[PDB]
């Protein structure tokens, strides 16, 4: 691959680069430096490449096409770059050329072929329909794909990938005015979407995730009005009747229940309060570690419960000694016992945690402090077991996440959003320091590699960049440094954070960033040299 060859001002050079280097090298443009993106995705390049793609798509004879896969990937890579790069912004004549190229592939006699080579190009075409803002333009095709799908198509990895892209189209259509204006009247689409979700042959099959996505997008259709409304309702009713909230088809049932509940009246479907009934069914084991920790789990062994409780129990005492808490909670905080909610797997977490705890689940778990002052507030850590998690509890991220509960109750006044200064360095650093103590090779490695952060930079860390190196490793390094070399300052900072004096907290660590930078650097040196 040679990414520089996409920067030429001649569109023929760029086309030659796409053809000769292929989709695997085009992948680089999604994350290339801005200079390359502004040059690769000139409006003229997008136009000329779409015009070439139109002619190639018209001639396509089935059986896949490495070149068309690369061309459509490039075009939607351009829309990705345009969305995230303020210096990439297409002129108004780009998208009609892209729409013409999608049209050429859609109108081809081979559009509905079932093969993995076809699926590879078809995938990039369907995603381009969303990336290019064309969600309103191919609803008959979405309908045909939903109705044509069967177990033969489902054998092919790249056909599953491609057709699953129609749910991305439905989802992205929410921001498309022509789509919103028309989707409520798409009665055939609604029927095909419902019947796709109802395919019994999807249960336990490689395409079950698609039927689940269909159930979700069907429930989302209740946010629109029009001649399709009664078909949407009928099909949702059949989903809720055919499947159950826990058991066969529950990914489909719960996918639909989530959007129905948010956008519609749960009582029109008989699914009100389903979240609390689901919780009792999925999280059916209860194991009380102590007055301050209780586990609710889906399917853990007794050995796992005992090991989780003793690991958290050890961290709990270590936290209280290290943070010099006196076991005195902050004021206005009645989160007296952490509830640790452990699902059997990442998949189970993705299926059940969302509705039970009203959270997004594209993550490795999370701690919900809630509002500690409200009577009835429940502090919930939501997690899952994994085979490569830590023995002997095998709960992913348990030891780190548990510290957020203790830091929240004993160090930081208020709910999660109460601070009016940045505190990510402390929150994440103390969770790493308490849970890992001095066993942190990754933290050493990020000093050794030559790229470092100052105290001042660490204190400004945010979740925005999602720089996990800066957040977790350098957060840990700064916390460990302050504990080992300046514990009295930490105790002084904690007087302010415990009371919610966030300005005093900031003024306090501002002093650290100027005074201690050079010692922080020597401390890193000693840490590296100890490793050798």
């Amino acid at each position: 691959c040679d990414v520089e060859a996409f920067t030429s001002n001649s569109s023929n050079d760029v086309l030659n680069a796409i053809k000769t280097q292929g989709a695997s090298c085009v992948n680089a443009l999604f994350s290339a430096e801005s200079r390359i993106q502004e040059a690769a995705f000139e409006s003229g390049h997008m136009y000329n490449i779409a015009k070439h793609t139109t002619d190639l798509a018209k001639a396509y004879a089935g059986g896949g096409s490495d070149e068309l896969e690369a061309l459509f990937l490039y075009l939607r890579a351009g829309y990705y770059a345009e969305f995230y790069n303020s210096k990439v912004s297409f002129l108004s004549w780009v998208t009609p050329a892209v729409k013409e190229a999608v049209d050429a592939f859609v109108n081809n006699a081979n559009f509905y072929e079932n093969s993995d080579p076809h699926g590879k190009v078809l995938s990039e075409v369907i995603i381009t329909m969303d990336s290019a803002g064309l969600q309103h333009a191919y609803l008959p095709q979405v309908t045909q794909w939903l109705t044509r799908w069967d177990s033969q198509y489902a054998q092919n990895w790249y056909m599953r990938n491609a057709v699953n892209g129609v749910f991305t189209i439905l989802f992205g259509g929410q921001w498309n005015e022509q789509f919103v204006q028309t989707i409520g009247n798409q009665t055939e689409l609604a029927k095909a979407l419902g019947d796709f979700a109802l395919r019994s042959s999807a249960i336990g099959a490689s395409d079950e995730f698609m039927a689940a996505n269909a159930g979700r997008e069907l429930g989302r259709l209740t946010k629109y009005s029009g001649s399709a409304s009664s078909t949407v309702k009928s099909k949702l009713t059949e989903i809720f009747a055919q499947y159950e909230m826990y058991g066969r088809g529950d990914a489909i049932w719960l996918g639909a229940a989530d959007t129905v509940s948010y956008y519609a009246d749960c009582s029109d479907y008989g699914i009100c309060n389903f979240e609390s009934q689901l919780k009792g069914l999925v999280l059916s084991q209860s194991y009380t570690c102590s007055p301050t920790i209780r586990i609710l789990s889906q399917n853990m062994t007794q050995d796992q419960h005992v090991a989780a409780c003793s690991k958290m129990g050890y961290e709990e005492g270590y936290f209280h000694t290290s943070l010099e808490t006196g076991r005195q909670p902050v004021a206005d905080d009645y989160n007296t016992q952490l509830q640790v909610n452990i699902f059997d797997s990442s998949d189970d977490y993705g299926k059940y945690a969302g509705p039970i705890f009203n959270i997004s689940t594209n993550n490795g778990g999370m701690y919900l402090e809630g509002d500690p002052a409200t009577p009835g507030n429940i502090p919930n850590f939501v997690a899952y077991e994994a085979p490569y998690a830590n023995p002997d509890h095998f709960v992913w991220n348990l030891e780190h996440e548990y510290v957020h509960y203790l830091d929240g109750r004993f160090d930081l006044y208020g709910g999660f959003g109460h601070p009016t200064e940045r505190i990510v360095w402390w929150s994440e650093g103390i969770a790493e320091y308490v849970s890992k103590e001095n066993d942190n090779q990754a933290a050493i490695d990020t000093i050794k590699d030559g790229s470092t952060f100052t105290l001042s930079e660490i204190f400004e860390t945010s979740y925005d960049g999602f720089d996990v190196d800066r957040i977790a490793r350098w957060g840990y390094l700064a916390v460990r440094f302050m504990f080992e070399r300046h514990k009295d300052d930490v105790n002084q900072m904690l007087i302010e954070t415990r009371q919610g004096n966030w300005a005093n907290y900031k003024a306090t660590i501002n002093q650290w960033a100027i005074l201690y930078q050079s010692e922080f650097e020597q401390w890193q040196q000693a840490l590296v040299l100890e490793h050798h």
Partner: peptide, 12 residues
Amino acid sequence: DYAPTKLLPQQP
């Protein structure tokens, strides 16, 4: 939040 798709998962 709407976000345009990056890459699709390849076959293992």
